[PDB]
Design an enzyme around this catalytic site. Structure first.
Site, PDB file in Angstrom:
ATOM      1  N   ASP A 137     -15.648 103.880 -57.646  1.00  0.00           N
ATOM      2  CA  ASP A 137     -15.865 105.252 -58.109  1.00  0.00           C
ATOM      3  C   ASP A 137     -14.897 105.655 -59.218  1.00  0.00           C
ATOM      4  O   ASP A 137     -14.307 106.741 -59.181  1.00  0.00           O
ATOM      5  CB  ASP A 137     -15.713 106.222 -56.924  1.00  0.00           C
ATOM      6  CG  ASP A 137     -16.469 105.754 -55.684  1.00  0.00           C
ATOM      7  OD1 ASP A 137     -16.157 104.657 -55.183  1.00  0.00           O
ATOM      8  OD2 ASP A 137     -17.377 106.472 -55.201  1.00  0.00           O
ATOM      9  N   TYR A 173     -20.671 107.799 -63.587  1.00  0.00           N
ATOM     10  CA  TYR A 173     -20.771 109.214 -63.255  1.00  0.00           C
ATOM     11  C   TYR A 173     -21.371 110.005 -64.413  1.00  0.00           C
ATOM     12  O   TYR A 173     -21.103 111.194 -64.576  1.00  0.00           O
ATOM     13  CB  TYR A 173     -19.399 109.798 -62.900  1.00  0.00           C
ATOM     14  CG  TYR A 173     -18.924 109.371 -61.533  1.00  0.00           C
ATOM     15  CD1 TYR A 173     -18.408 108.096 -61.323  1.00  0.00           C
ATOM     16  CD2 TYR A 173     -19.043 110.223 -60.436  1.00  0.00           C
ATOM     17  CE1 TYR A 173     -18.028 107.677 -60.065  1.00  0.00           C
ATOM     18  CE2 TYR A 173     -18.670 109.814 -59.174  1.00  0.00           C
ATOM     19  CZ  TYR A 173     -18.163 108.538 -58.992  1.00  0.00           C
ATOM     20  OH  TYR A 173     -17.810 108.111 -57.735  1.00  0.00           O
ATOM     21  N   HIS A 199     -18.623 113.173 -46.855  1.00  0.00           N
ATOM     22  CA  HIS A 199     -19.548 112.119 -46.448  1.00  0.00           C
ATOM     23  C   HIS A 199     -19.371 111.609 -45.038  1.00  0.00           C
ATOM     24  O   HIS A 199     -19.845 110.519 -44.708  1.00  0.00           O
ATOM     25  CB  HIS A 199     -19.448 110.944 -47.405  1.00  0.00           C
ATOM     26  CG  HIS A 199     -19.564 111.339 -48.838  1.00  0.00           C
ATOM     27  ND1 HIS A 199     -20.670 111.991 -49.341  1.00  0.00           N
ATOM     28  CD2 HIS A 199     -18.700 111.211 -49.873  1.00  0.00           C
ATOM     29  CE1 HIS A 199     -20.483 112.249 -50.623  1.00  0.00           C
ATOM     30  NE2 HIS A 199     -19.296 111.787 -50.971  1.00  0.00           N
ATOM     31  N   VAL A 256     -16.061 107.722 -50.795  1.00  0.00           N
ATOM     32  CA  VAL A 256     -15.116 108.783 -50.435  1.00  0.00           C
ATOM     33  C   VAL A 256     -13.983 108.670 -51.435  1.00  0.00           C
ATOM     34  O   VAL A 256     -13.328 107.641 -51.517  1.00  0.00           O
ATOM     35  CB  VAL A 256     -14.535 108.609 -49.002  1.00  0.00           C
ATOM     36  CG1 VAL A 256     -13.567 109.743 -48.701  1.00  0.00           C
ATOM     37  CG2 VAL A 256     -15.658 108.604 -47.972  1.00  0.00           C
ATOM     38  N   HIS A 257     -13.762 109.732 -52.195  1.00  0.00           N
ATOM     39  CA  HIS A 257     -12.739 109.739 -53.230  1.00  0.00           C
ATOM     40  C   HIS A 257     -11.318 109.851 -52.718  1.00  0.00           C
ATOM     41  O   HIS A 257     -10.638 110.862 -52.913  1.00  0.00           O
ATOM     42  CB  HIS A 257     -13.040 110.872 -54.188  1.00  0.00           C
ATOM     43  CG  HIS A 257     -14.433 110.825 -54.726  1.00  0.00           C
ATOM     44  ND1 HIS A 257     -15.129 111.957 -55.094  1.00  0.00           N
ATOM     45  CD2 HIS A 257     -15.260 109.779 -54.959  1.00  0.00           C
ATOM     46  CE1 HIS A 257     -16.325 111.608 -55.533  1.00  0.00           C
ATOM     47  NE2 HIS A 257     -16.430 110.293 -55.462  1.00  0.00           N
ATOM     48  N   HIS A 284     -21.256 100.485 -50.682  1.00  0.00           N
ATOM     49  CA  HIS A 284     -20.706 101.715 -51.225  1.00  0.00           C
ATOM     50  C   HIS A 284     -20.260 102.731 -50.177  1.00  0.00           C
ATOM     51  O   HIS A 284     -19.123 103.222 -50.228  1.00  0.00           O
ATOM     52  CB  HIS A 284     -21.716 102.371 -52.158  1.00  0.00           C
ATOM     53  CG  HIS A 284     -21.173 103.565 -52.875  1.00  0.00           C
ATOM     54  ND1 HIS A 284     -20.140 103.476 -53.780  1.00  0.00           N
ATOM     55  CD2 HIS A 284     -21.504 104.876 -52.808  1.00  0.00           C
ATOM     56  CE1 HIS A 284     -19.856 104.678 -54.243  1.00  0.00           C
ATOM     57  NE2 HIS A 284     -20.669 105.546 -53.669  1.00  0.00           N
TER      58      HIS A 284
HETATM   59 FE   LIG Z   1     -18.338 108.478 -55.996  1.00  0.00          FE
HETATM   60 MN   LIG Z   2     -20.765 107.678 -53.999  1.00  0.00          MN
END
Ligand SMILES: [Fe+3]
Ligand SMILES: [Mn+2]
Ligand SMILES: *[C@H]1O[C@H](CO)[C@@H](O[C@H]2O[C@H](CO)[C@@H](O[C@@H]3O[C@H](CO)[C@@H](O)[C@H](O)[C@@H]3O)[C@H](O)[C@H]2NC(C)=O)[C@H](O[C@@H]2O[C@@H](C)[C@@H](O)[C@@H](O)[C@@H]2O)[C@H]1NC(C)=O
Ligand SMILES: *[C@H]1O[C@H](CO)[C@@H](O[C@H]2O[C@H](CO)[C@@H](O[C@@H]3O[C@H](CO)[C@@H](O)[C@H](O)[C@@H]3O)[C@H](O)[C@H]2NC(C)=O)[C@H](O[C@H]2O[C@@H](C)[C@@H](O)[C@@H](O)[C@@H]2O)[C@H]1NC(C)=O
Ligand SMILES: *[C@@H]1O[C@H](CO)[C@@H](O[C@@H]2O[C@H](CO)[C@@H](O)[C@H](O)[C@H]2NC(C)=O)[C@H](O[C@@H]2O[C@@H](C)[C@@H](O)[C@@H](O)[C@@H]2O)[C@H]1NC(C)=O
Ligand SMILES: *[C@@H]1O[C@H](CO)[C@@H](O[C@@H]2O[C@H](CO)[C@@H](O)[C@H](O)[C@H]2NC(C)=O)[C@H](O[C@H]2O[C@@H](C)[C@@H](O)[C@@H](O)[C@@H]2O)[C@H]1NC(C)=O
Ligand SMILES: *[C@@H]1O[C@H](CO)[C@@H](O[C@@H]2O[C@H](CO)[C@@H](O)[C@H](O)[C@H]2NC(C)=O)[C@H](O)[C@H]1NC(C)=O
Ligand SMILES: *[C@@H]1O[C@H](CO)[C@@H](O)[C@H](O[C@H]2O[C@@H](C)[C@@H](O)[C@@H](O)[C@@H]2O)[C@H]1NC(C)=O
Ligand SMILES: *[C@@H]1O[C@H](CO)[C@@H](O)[C@H](O[C@H]2O[C@@H](C)[C@@H](O)[C@@H](O)[C@@H]2O)[C@H]1NC(C)=O
Ligand SMILES: *[C@@H]1O[C@H](CO)[C@@H](O)[C@H](O)[C@H]1NC(C)=O
Ligand SMILES: [Fe+3]
Ligand SMILES: [Mn+2]
EC number: 3.1.3.2
Lengths: 424, 426
Positions: free
Chosen positions: A134, A166, A295, A323-324, A285
């Site tokens: 990500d 993104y 999430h 998950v960031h 992912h």
């Molecule tokens: Fe993401």
């Molecule tokens: Mn994602």
């Protein structure tokens, strides 16, 4: 919120600069091209499709004579967007553990790169994998990548956990931001292969602008070595590199019993040989284990079908993003449930892999700070900070994992774990 | 499991007979063509693509003035197989509750059929749906269909739960068995629409013979009214018919949050209007609740993501197949789990739908006899016997479901349930 247009790097950013020269080959990237490792897929994009733009010249450094190959070219449209000429060249039968030089373009547009094929697959063959997920194209994204490049561990290939550009966060999923991401990431992917995993940001589903079929941009830009793996779809496949057997799964594709991916996956598990490749690694992912608010439990569906297998074949470790932030689990499992017994609590299990969440590459959406409380026992470490990870394989029994935060030195490890192979 | 080549009906079976005449239109079938019901998709196959083979003539029983429409034609290949010319014609804007006649072919190959559009969508508009799943083309399959046709309940449309021809069970998934199935089922689908649900036997995934992309045969033979529903894929869509709003889901397609199907499904739930269509029905191949040994818990993945919605929007009933036998659940739910609370036991829930398993149409694989033991409290009735079902909507509050076994008379009900609508009677 955050708005992509306010945090992503500016269009004029140096990292997005177009290489000079007529019809300059750009957005150059490579990935493993075969099942064994002596293969490679070189990709580059050119604004025009004129004689010469579709040729790669490559040669081993200790072997003057240079070979030339032709690529397969494709273009695609998405709403009012049209791509340039994208080239994909699959070179096979190279030599193991040897440096290769390759160049694209002509005149003063000519560009040269290099890469190093991995050593022949073997039980004790060491290898260092970079871990990123990500990333996107924000200023943090640039830092993360910079840190990976300076990491004294010297990663030779990057295992990518999903959500590349993104760009789908821009108006109309502006595919121009896929191009920028291509130029930005090039400084790394042009030299060492990135092993792709498809994330929900690669879905690019936009009915509002008449785009109902998913993965169009991603699938056209980033080919995968699925056929050599026995898969008829680029979103799921497997490769062998050094002492590792890597299975890449697709979170947003069908995966229940009888589905193409499921059948491919189970067959693939039986092809695994721990005597040749001790380290069994899985990429998906969406994490099957995540204790962050964001999430939360989104991976429950896949866990229900796949966790049983991860445990039975003893996957060593599972890497995910989505998950960031960062998180690392204890070796646990929750495969005893049958409804009636009500056994639905994750329990310590030495036959289960360690679950890793490294979707903190720095994309525009920002950090996933809120966590469930208190910390569940299945979670060993969780912190919301941008960064990258390293999986350092030493031999058939030891492998060292470590997390690197952007606030720290490229080489500083905020967390780490020495893994003991589950088979040896 | 039994060998398909030994139990499926013979190639020369009367039910597989090719209609006579030059380039005779065959494998004729229809399905709803729009969101409201005044639409229809007529499908027919012709061995040659010559002038006339691509035209449908249709008219109102009342009228004498017949209209003509042209279809869209397609062909496909699968391993060493090549299809004939398949035609699909989507006729819209018909009149509600009116009988229509349509014909294909010319000369002595000419064939005439008919169908009846449903009444305009309304809260108390009654309607009788037939229920069939995993029929295949065995001798039992023929009995099941025969019984449905003679059922005194008189079904006007068939809700199909998946696994159509089971031709993938023949060598190389012999697509010639898709053609036979098309001729066999025609006696019904040519007159009343069958609302398709895709099952794992429609996947037709065969790497061994170089076929990696799924649903090729099914998708080419059985079109769906997905676009009118807002879906860009034929495996998932929704239609409104009479007093019911039917959502058809795809078990073998991606369905987790953010997936195309998931986004489509959630949007679709918000489009539902119980004041116009009281009966909210869902179709999926793999049952979220099944206490048979066969495929036990295979539906757990989808239950995790979709059950919460089924309960929140109060789906009245869910029909599935896959398990070759019959089963009916109590209104229950298992949506309280969050890992930490360990709440993973299905509990009585009047906001939840009744779950039905009717994958006992009679396909070659046979009956799924072994059941988990003892009978879980969430299961109200379970029996391994071939048959079909009926969902009889009387009004906005009452609907009568019933199961019909092949051993019994077409009209005998071995099990049944009077349902109370969840929105107006619960
Ligand atoms: Fe993401
Ligand atoms: Mn994602
Ligand atoms: C496909 O259609 C797109 C529609 O959004 C278009 O986006 C742009 O549309 C107009 C046309 O240039 C831009 O400019 C504004 O248009 C309004 C019209 O009401 C006008 O009153 C303003 O004065 C202003 O000029 C929009 O800003 C832009 N859409 C947004 C908000 O991002 C695409 O074309 C684009 O045109 C320019 C904006 C370029 O700079 C690019 O962004 C792009 O070429 C079009 N597809 C393409 C080719 O991208
Ligand atoms: C729509 O939904 C139901 C579908 O049938 C319907 O059935 C109920 O009403 C029937 C009579 O209208 C009743 O059967 C009749 O019983 C009498 C008694 O002796 C007999 O003469 C008749 O020959 C019938 O056998 C059903 O048993 C009953 N169904 C059940 C068991 O729920 C609904 O009827 C309701 O209509 C109301 C106006 C009122 O009559 C209610 O008592 C009745 O339940 C019907 N609802 C509507 C809106 O009409
Ligand atoms: C597709 O390949 C099949 C074998 O891989 C062919 O079927 C084989 O046909 C032989 C003689 O035609 C027969 O001796 C073999 O036993 C048979 N094997 C199978 C799959 O059962 C097939 O050819 C067709 O065979 C049957 C189905 C006939 O009814 C005709 O349809 C064909 O002869 C191949 N399809 C082709 C190329 O038509
Ligand atoms: C949901 O469906 C019902 C049935 O078609 C719509 O009802 C309308 O208004 C009354 C309300 O009882 C009903 O008796 C009529 O048969 C029906 N008439 C129509 C088609 O307008 C209901 O309302 C819709 O129409 C009006 C009432 C409007 O204010 C708004 O409520 C709506 O557009 C439908 N509601 C929707 C579209 O979600
Ligand atoms: C992204 O980070 C890199 C660091 O890796 C920055 O690279 C510098 O780029 C300038 C030219 O703009 C060079 O002169 C320096 O030598 C580079 N430094 C390093 C450490 O390589 C780059 O500027 C950053 N890009 C953005 C837009 O912030
Ligand atoms: C796993 O890799 C080993 C090293 O490459 C290999 O020796 C194993 O094969 C063993 O069994 C068979 C295949 C025999 O021919 C011989 O190669 C070994 O004893 C291999 N495992 C398998 C079964 O492929
Ligand atoms: C595998 O790599 C490990 C990480 O560097 C290394 O520690 C292992 O060597 C160890 O072996 C055991 C016997 C221990 O007593 C000591 O000799 C070493 O730390 C290494 N394993 C191998 C190849 O022996
Ligand atoms: C199928 O049933 C029909 C009547 O329902 C009968 O005419 C036909 O012979 C049966 N087909 C076979 C061969 O079983
Ligand atoms: Fe079946
Ligand atoms: Mn099935």
């Amino acid at each position: 919120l955050p708005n992509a247009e306010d945090v992503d790097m500016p269009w004029d950013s140096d990292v997005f600069a177009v290489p000079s020269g007529y019809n300059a080959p750009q957005q150059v990237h490579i990935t493993q091209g075969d099942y064994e490792g002596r293969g490679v897929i070189i990709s580059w994009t050119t604004p025009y499709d004129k004689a010469g733009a579709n040729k790669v010249f490559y040669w081993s450094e200790n072997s003057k004579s240079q070979k030339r190959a032709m690529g397969t070219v494709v273009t695609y449209k998405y709403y009012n967007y049209t791509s340039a000429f994208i080239h994909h060249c699959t070179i096979k039968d190279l030599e193991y553990d040897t440096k290769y030089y390759y160049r694209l373009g002509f005149g003063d547009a000519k560009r040269q790169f290099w890469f190093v094929t991995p050593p022949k697959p073997g039980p004790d063959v060491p290898y260092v994998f970079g871990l990123i997920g990500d990333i996107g194209q924000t200023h943090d994204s640039n830092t993360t990548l910079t840190h990976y490049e300076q990491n004294s561990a010297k990663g030779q290939a990057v295992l990518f956990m999903g959500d590349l550009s993104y760009s789908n966060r821009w108006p109309n999923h502006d595919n121009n931001r896929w191009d920028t991401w291509g130029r930005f990431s090039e400084r790394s992917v042009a030299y060492q292969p990135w092993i792709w995993t498809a994330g929900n940001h690669e879905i690019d589903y936009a009915p509002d602008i008449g785009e109902y079929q998913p993965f169009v941009p991603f699938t056209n830009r980033y080919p995968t070595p699925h056929e050599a793996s026995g898969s008829g779809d680029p979103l799921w496949y497997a490769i062998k590199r050094a002492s590792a057997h890597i299975i890449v799964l697709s979170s947003y594709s069908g995966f229940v019993k009888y589905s193409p991916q499921y059948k491919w996956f189970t067959s693939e598990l039986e092809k695994v040989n721990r005597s040749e490749t001790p380290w069994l690694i899985v990429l998906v992912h969406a994490p099957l284990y995540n204790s962050y608010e964001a999430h939360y439990m989104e991976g429950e569906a896949m866990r229900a079908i796949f966790e049983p297998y991860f445990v039975y074949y003893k996957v060593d470790i599972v890497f995910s993003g989505h998950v960031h932030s960062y998180e690392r689990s204890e070796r646990v499992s929750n495969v005893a449930y049958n409804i009636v017994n009500a056994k639905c609590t994750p329990v310590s299990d030495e036959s289960a892999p360690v679950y890793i969440t490294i979707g903190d590459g720095g994309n525009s959406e920002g950090l996933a700070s809120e966590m469930t409380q208190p910390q569940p026992s299945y979670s060993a470490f969780r912190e919301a900070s941008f960064g990258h990870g390293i999986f350092d394989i030493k031999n058939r029994t030891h492998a060292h994992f470590s997390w690197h935060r952007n606030q720290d030195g490229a080489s500083v490890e905020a967390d780490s774990l020495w893994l003991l192979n589950r088979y040896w």
